[PDB]
Amino acid sequence: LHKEPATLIKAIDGDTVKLMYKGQPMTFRLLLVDTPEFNEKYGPEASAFTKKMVENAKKIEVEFDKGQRTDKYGRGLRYIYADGKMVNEALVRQGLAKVAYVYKGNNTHEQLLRKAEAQAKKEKLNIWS
Ligand SMILES: Cc1cn([C@H]2C[C@@H](OP(=O)(O)O)[C@@H](COP(=O)(O)O)O2)c(=O)[nH]c1=O
Numbered sequence: 001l002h003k004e005p006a007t008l009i010k011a012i013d014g015d016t017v018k019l020m021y022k023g024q025p026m027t028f029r030l031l032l033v034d035t036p037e038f039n040e041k042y043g044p045e046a047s048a049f050t051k052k053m054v055e056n057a058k059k060i061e062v063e064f065d066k067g068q069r070t071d072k073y074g075r076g077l078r079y080i081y082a083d084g085k086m087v088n089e090a091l092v093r094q095g096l097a098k099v100a101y102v103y104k105g106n107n108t109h110e111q112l113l114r115k116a117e118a119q120a121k122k123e124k125l126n127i128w129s
């Protein structure tokens, strides 16, 4: 798995962001994770967490998996990194996302994220009440 460069265009919500990628604007969906919609409980907090993370970052990078790169709504499916810290893992670790939409074979990172969710659940963080 290899990382490519990308520039923040706009934060959107907990698990989507708009990025300039190979010269084109694109909406990106985070792999393996599901935040609440903004209208749901911990939605605003998820959006807020991802916004700060991508906005405060000097370098954002994107990482596709072995399977689907672009989902049926035209969104780039990626692990996203903010100064080398994975947003996907980070949300799960804070209990602001659930591990979700794990399809084979697009799940290189499942074990690391489930590792993070175990710890967040143990900790009763945010969505784990
Ligand atoms: C995360 C992810 C979502 N999706 C699609 C499944 C979709 O469900 P539907 O067919 O129910 O729309 C949608 C859900 O994402 P959102 O959580 O952004 O709505 O995104 C993928 O196809 N692959 C993925 O890896």
Ligand SMILES: [Ca+2]
Pocket: 015, 034, 035, 036, 037
């Ligand atoms: Ca969602």
